[PDB]
Amino acid sequence: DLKRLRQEPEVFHRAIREKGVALDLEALLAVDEQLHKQQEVIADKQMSVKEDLDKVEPAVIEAQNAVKSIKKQHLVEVRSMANPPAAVKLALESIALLLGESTTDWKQIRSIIMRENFIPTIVNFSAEEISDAIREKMKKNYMSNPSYNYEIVNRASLAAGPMVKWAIAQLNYADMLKRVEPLRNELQKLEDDAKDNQQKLEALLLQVPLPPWPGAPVGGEEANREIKRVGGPPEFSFPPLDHVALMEKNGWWEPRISQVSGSRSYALKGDLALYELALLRFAMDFMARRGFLPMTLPSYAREKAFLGTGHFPAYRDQVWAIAETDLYLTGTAEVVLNALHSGEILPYEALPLRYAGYAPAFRSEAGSFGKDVRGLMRVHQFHKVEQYVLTEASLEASDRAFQELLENAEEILRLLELPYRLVEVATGDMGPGKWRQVDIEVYLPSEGRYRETHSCSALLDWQARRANLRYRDPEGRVRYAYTLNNTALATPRILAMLLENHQLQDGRVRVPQALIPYMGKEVLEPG
Amino acid sequence: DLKRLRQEPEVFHRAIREKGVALDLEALLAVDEQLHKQQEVIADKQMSVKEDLDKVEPAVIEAQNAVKSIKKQHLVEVRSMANPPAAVKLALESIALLLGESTTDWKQIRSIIMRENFIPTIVNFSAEEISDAIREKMKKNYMSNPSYNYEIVNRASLAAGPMVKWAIAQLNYADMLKRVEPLRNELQKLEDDAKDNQQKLEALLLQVPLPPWPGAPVGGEEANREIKRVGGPPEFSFPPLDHVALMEKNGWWEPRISQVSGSRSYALKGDLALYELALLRFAMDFMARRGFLPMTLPSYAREKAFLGTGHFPAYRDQVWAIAETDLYLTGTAEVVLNALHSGEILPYEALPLRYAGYAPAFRSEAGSFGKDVRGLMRVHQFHKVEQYVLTEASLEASDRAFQELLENAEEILRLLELPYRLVEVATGDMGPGKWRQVDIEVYLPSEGRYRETHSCSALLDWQARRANLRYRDPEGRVRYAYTLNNTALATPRILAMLLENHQLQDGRVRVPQALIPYMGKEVLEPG
Ligand SMILES: Nc1ncnc2c1ncn2[C@@H]1O[C@H](COP(=O)(O)O)[C@@H](O)[C@H]1O
Numbered sequence A, B: 001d002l003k004r005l006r007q008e009p010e011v012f013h014r015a016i017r018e019k020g021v022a023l024d025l026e027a028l029l030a031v032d033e034q035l036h037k038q039q040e041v042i043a044d045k046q047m048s049v050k051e052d053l054d055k056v057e058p059a060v061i062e063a064q065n066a067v068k069s070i071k072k073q074h075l076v077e078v079r080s081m082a083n084p085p086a087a088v089k090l091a092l093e094s095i096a097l098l099l100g101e102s103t104t105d106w107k108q109i110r111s112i113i114m115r116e117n118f119i120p121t122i123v124n125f126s127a128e129e130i131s132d133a134i135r136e137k138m139k140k141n142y143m144s145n146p147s148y149n150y151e152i153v154n155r156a157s158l159a160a161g162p163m164v165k166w167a168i169a170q171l172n173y174a175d176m177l178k179r180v181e182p183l184r185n186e187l188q189k190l191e192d193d194a195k196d197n198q199q200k201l202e203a204l205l206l207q208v209p210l211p212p213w214p215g216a217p218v219g220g221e222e223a224n225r226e227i228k229r230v231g232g233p234p235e236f237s238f239p240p241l242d243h244v245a246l247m248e249k250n251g252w253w254e255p256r257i258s259q260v261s262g263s264r265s266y267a268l269k270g271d272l273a274l275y276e277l278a279l280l281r282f283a284m285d286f287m288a289r290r291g292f293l294p295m296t297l298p299s300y301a302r303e304k305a306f307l308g309t310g311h312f313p314a315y316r317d318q319v320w321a322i323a324e325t326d327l328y329l330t331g332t333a334e335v336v337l338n339a340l341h342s343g344e345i346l347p348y349e350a351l352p353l354r355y356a357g358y359a360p361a362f363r364s365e366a367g368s369f370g371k372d373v374r375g376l377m378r379v380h381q382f383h384k385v386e387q388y389v390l391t392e393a394s395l396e397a398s399d400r401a402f403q404e405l406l407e408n409a410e411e412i413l414r415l416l417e418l419p420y421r422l423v424e425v426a427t428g429d430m431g432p433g434k435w436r437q438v439d440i441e442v443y444l445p446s447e448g449r450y451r452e453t454h455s456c457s458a459l460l461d462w463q464a465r466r467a468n469l470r471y472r473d474p475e476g477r478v479r480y481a482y483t484l485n486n487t488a489l490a491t492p493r494i495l496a497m498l499l500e501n502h503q504l505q506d507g508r509v510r511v512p513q514a515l516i517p518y519m520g521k522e523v524l525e526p527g
């Protein structure tokens, strides 16, 4: 918000430092000021060109109607002459010259006058299409002749009089075009400087961070801090396998996929494949019982919807584009969900919107080299159910929906019988649009640590302003809404945690009580 | 198969007209035969060049081993000598010349020959480094001298003797490289023209079609035959709504999705969203119970997978590529499933492989615009459970696999309580690599007609050959397998037939008996 950025210089400097955003806020505002000055100059100069061309247009329209109104009997007593009066012959020659005729034969040119297409070509005629050669030939041969004149020619023919009128108006228009050209070329550069400034500004603006909540740790990722843990590291009395080894022992995965599809791919087999789909539906039912509206969505969107969530331009490199298309595969259903209502004024009574959106998800994982190289932790395409909340503009509403979103993910993990913890994310690790982020993490025995499975975020109105999400308040004004989101459940990474936490001594794997109705059994069969 | 193919220039020629396919079989053969010539022309010339580098290679190695094998005291002897003999001066001189530091100062030579790096760099020197002037000079100056002789100088110094063998060897080699110059130069082109034809040739082999089975109707689409019908077109005592209007009545879809994601997109809400996931699980459970192996799969693959099935290049234009990647989004799990075993020799006892793979599916829908533009009939991204079978090269095995593929699809529609019919696909309409194709279509009341939902195909060893799929038979011979496939269930298109066939008077939609246990209810609830 420009005006808000000025009246508040400190708040935004602090926000920018806190988030580790390199944003020069004065250079931004100086782009805005410079643009504004460029636009006013462009407008004065456009006016100057417009005045010039407005000078010569009426004579063209007057002559054009005069030629059209020449009677037929008059076109005939010009076509009749073998032997034209000199001032009359001058007139026709100039018309033939201008029309691009390639013959100065009088007989030949006295003819086009009664062409079915003559007037039609005269009307359609454009003075911008006159060459400088014809232009200079017109001044040398004809303007410079004392008889080449409406007054003088019109006395001799009321057919040639109009035509000399028309030819002169065109020449004058043509000479005005010529005059106006250097201002027009200039205006062209200014106009392009200005467009370039508008894109330079719009892209600074899209970097402005939300001020973070006062309770968030201040620093980079190393300032993230655990606030809670529920359950613990399992203890096995046998020597536990990691998830890859479990899937091998049991025939639950298809390693051959990396030859078909490249690295960071996975393909599940037998009871584990069925388990993945059981998990997505369990999570959708769960979210539906919770009063969130179930949705199934495409995994692609246009640029505008990545712009509105903040995925573009900041995290552009995490996104796969679809070539020879304007479409990009989405990493999360939040991009589609956030975009559904752009441009609408929601009635306050609809508030809040609570969506549980399922979509396949795609990530380039560019820049993940050496991270999670094996198994189910980090893959290119995977399946997620997302919680998305749109809310009226209060901290109270937003604090409330953030609590619910977090309890939902926790209750899901309790039902999955997995040990987890909550982590408060630092201002420098939160991302630019965030008020608060809390990550939920599940204990993964093979790495001896917790690994994220959920990220819960409140944004306030920072997505709302970018995606133009607005609502009407009880008072009758339109305001931008607040938004939040959190994962409900994503596979196959949660499968890593489930395999390792619920592995039994004989290498088989238990199903948690809440998943038994979905699976038809209490133990995954060693296919 | 080149030989086999030519062996029956009539069989392939008939397959080509039968399938309505454009492939000039004569040109392809001409290229293959012509390619065989370029390949000999290249075998020969490559040989003529090894022979020439074979005269000069062994002598350079021996000499390289001779200098490597100079005792370390013949080193002090020559490099501590104050005035040597003129033949040794000459010898060491030649070597300073070859290494690009030519001088006639014994001192400098003295100097150089002493460098720790002296030996290491002659043993590592390559005749390619020797220039024109050096060759010239080493001939005019040093080959010409009569004291420039190994034996003549291997007598005065045991250290400089091997040095002149190395210098002579390196000079003959440099000379060989020089005449082999224009020789090795012709190769580069011949070989590019050779690769060109591999490309043009294998490009055309990929156009070769399979002869259709003898009981497939001949001709175009107009010759497809209805072979069976089950259930009937519904009759309602009310005015039936079309699926888009039923979805609209019940609040089950989000039409805003086309502003976010473009045309041919869809987003389900509420009970219909849930129904979509329930259908996919239902189809998977059913396939498992039929003894097919359930799998969940990615939706992208490298080019090879598409080549292997026949999607490339025949239908490359229905496919979405992923920008700045070597990957493409697959329109059916069949592309991943068929590529899984590329390159393997499957053991006989693994056969047949029966896979029920689930993946999101993507199509560009290029060509088809002004058809099924509104609703769930033709969307860019959808969900599909696919049946895929890989079998022994046996008509017996393929025919049984095809009937079970067909019956699987038929019992799924019956269970879904949907009126359907089966259509025997004609030669001109089955696709290039098909043996048999039976389409199954479901009655859509709003449109007054059956609309395809499944295409059951047998391809014999068409895909095997393209994807290198093979098995070892009981006698222990490696043979290509036969492949088959058919859809199990695809959404959302199946939902358009469900809404409409299943719709009640009051506007709501009934859940067929088989899906009641998946939905927890008998009628779909509106928003
Ligand atoms: N490449 C990936 N592979 C598998 N799961 C992932 C991947 N990226 C993210 N996830 C999961 O999706 C959740 C939300 O991710 P994000 O939207 O990055 O917070 C994470 O906590 C993980 O559950």
Ligand SMILES: Nc1ncnc2c1ncn2[C@@H]1O[C@H](COP(=O)(O)O)[C@@H](O)[C@H]1O
Residues within 6 Å of the ligand: B332, B363, B365, B376, B377, B378, B379, B380, B382, B452, B453, B454, B455, B487, B490, B491, B492, B493, B494
């Ligand atoms: N663009 C699409 N939208 C919805 N369903 C589709 C689409 N393309 C194919 N299908 C479904 O998949 C079935 C078989 O597809 P195929 O694998 O192309 O033989 C069709 O008969 C439809 O049920």
